[PDB]
Amino acid sequence: NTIRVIVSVDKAKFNPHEVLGIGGHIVYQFKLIPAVVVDVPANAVGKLKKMPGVEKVEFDHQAVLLGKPSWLGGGSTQPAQTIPWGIERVKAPSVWSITDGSVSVIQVAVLDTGVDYDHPDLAANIAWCVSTLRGKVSTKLRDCADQNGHGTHVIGTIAALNNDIGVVGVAPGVQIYSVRVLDARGSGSYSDIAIGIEQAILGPDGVADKDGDGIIAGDPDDAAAEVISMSLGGPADDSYLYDMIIQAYNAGIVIVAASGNEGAPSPSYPAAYPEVIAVGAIDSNDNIASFSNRQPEVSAPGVDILSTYPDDSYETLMGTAMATPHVSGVVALIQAAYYQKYGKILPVGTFDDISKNTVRGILHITADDLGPTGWDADYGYGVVRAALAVQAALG
Ligand SMILES: [Ca+2]
Ligand SMILES: [Ca+2]
Ligand SMILES: [Ca+2]
Ligand SMILES: [Ca+2]
Ligand SMILES: [Ca+2]
Ligand SMILES: [Ca+2]
């Protein structure tokens, strides 16, 4: 009866009453790209096409969480802090006395099923809690809360607190924007994801560049996250989503996503974009996971990953979804350390980068090169290493 559709518009010519006229609804007018999410009856899609200036009509595609409960089972096994093997594998703990992410200009946004925001091992690091489900940006704690468990896990992988209890993240001091883009079942429309990406550059104040100097990420006066981490993917590549991705990147934000769990020969979207670092999964033997989609950029612990889980609990999951937050957390350390030393963050790399000069190049060079020498289709450049990466960033 009604269908959701994302129109790419001439914002000069385009009038939302026109769609309202044809029985439609306006879902979300993008702040950062000339586009608008709409509901139209099926027959109107014709009409919608040359509304002035509707220049492109794109359908709303489905993306899916990329982490699942592990074969080995189980919880936090002791009433003290556990360090999950993957945290130690990506060489995080030795960085912390330099930084643990707690540099205050630095935020990581995590677009997922939501967060258990008052989790005793998360709560202090959760700086903003948004949902974008169904096109409506909500900031109600009841809407922004994790109905699934996955985003809670993925977040504790980046940022669980270094303390008494539970687990610890790669960056246990970094601030987290939780942007709920996937429903209770872990399904998400691209539109909601695109909006989430926009919410992550806007930050809590709804403005991309308050103060007008074209510095977004790494700007103390702006609320923009510096990392957007997506433990999700789907098979569709739409141009308004890719445009949003180019908005993030241009803001100087590092974008990180799961390669996918299908054993496919290349990454899903958004991982498959040049501007995103595609992350594949290793196990505790440094073998590539056979589920891990091939031709990632880097790989990271992704099998039998103990992390935070609702409600105030912990669980062990697996997938390229679990690998991803290790990479994101390793970026957060890079940028935090870099900022703490120089007045400034590093630029996002490119995929090709083998320089000490960007986040991505440093990643690529300090990674632990497993399998065949150099970048390979299983490991990418290899397994990411916080300690060596932060040493490069500051050397
Ligand atoms: Ca802890
Ligand atoms: Ca600024
Ligand atoms: Ca400024
Ligand atoms: Ca920031
Ligand atoms: Ca709770
Ligand atoms: Ca290799």
Give domain limits for the chain.
Answer: 1-59, 60-395
How many Å lie between the centroid of ligand 1 and the Cα of residue 158?
Answer: 12
Taking the CA of 119 as reference, the closest ligand is 5
CB 319 within 8 A of CB 257: no
How many Å lie between the centroid of ligand 4 and the Cα of residue 252?
Answer: 10
Has domain 1-59 been given CATH number 3.30.70.80? yes
- Match domain 60-395 to its CATH number in 3.40.50.1100, 3.90.700.10, 3.40.640.10, 3.40.50.200: 3.40.50.200
Taking the CA of 367 as reference, the closest ligand is 6
How many Å lie between the centroid of ligand 4 and the Cα of residue 230?
Answer: 18
Taking the CA of 299 as reference, the closest ligand is 6
How many Å lie between the centroid of ligand 4 and the Cα of residue 126?
Answer: 13
Best CA proximity match to 146, nearest among 180, 170, 177, 189:
180
User: How large is the C-alpha radius of gyration of the chain?
Assistant: 20
- 3-state DSSP of the chain: CEEEEEEEECCCCCCCHHHHHCCCEEEEECCCCCEEEEEEECCHHHHHHCCCCEEEEEECCEEEECCEECCCCCCCCCCCCCCCHHHHHCCCHHHCCCCCCCCCCCEEEEEECCECCCCCCCHHHEEEEEECHHHCCECCHHHHECCCCHHHHHHHHHHCCCCCCCCCCCCCCCEEEEEECCCCCCEEEHHHHHHHHHHHHHHHHCCCCCCCCCCCCCCCCCCCCCEEEECEEECCCCHHHHHHHHHHHHCCCEEEEECCCCCCCCCCECCCCCCEEEEEEECCCCCECCCCCCCCCEEEECCCEEEEECCCEEEEEECHHHHHHHHHHHHHHHHHHHHHHCCCCCCCCCCCCCCCCCHHHHHHHHCECCCCCCCECCCECCECCHHHHHHHHHC
Best CA proximity match to 218, nearest among 342, 328, 345, 331:
345
Amino acid (one-letter) located at 230: M
Taking the CA of 306 as reference, the closest ligand is 1
Q: How far apart are CA 48 and CA 221, in angstroms?
A: 40
How many Å lie between the centroid of ligand 2 and the Cα of residue 199?
Answer: 16
How many Å lie between the centroid of ligand 2 and the Cα of residue 210?
Answer: 6
Taking the CA of 114 as reference, the closest ligand is 5
How many Å lie between the centroid of ligand 5 and the Cα of residue 283?
Answer: 29
How many Å lie between the centroid of ligand 2 and the Cα of residue 162?
Answer: 32
The experimental resolution of this structure, in angstroms, equals: 2.1
How many Å lie between the centroid of ligand 1 and the Cα of residue 166?
Answer: 4
How many Å lie between the centroid of ligand 6 and the Cα of residue 111?
Answer: 29
Q: In what order do the strands lie in the sheet with 25-29?
A: 25-29, 35-41, 2-9, 54-59
Taking the CA of 225 as reference, the closest ligand is 4
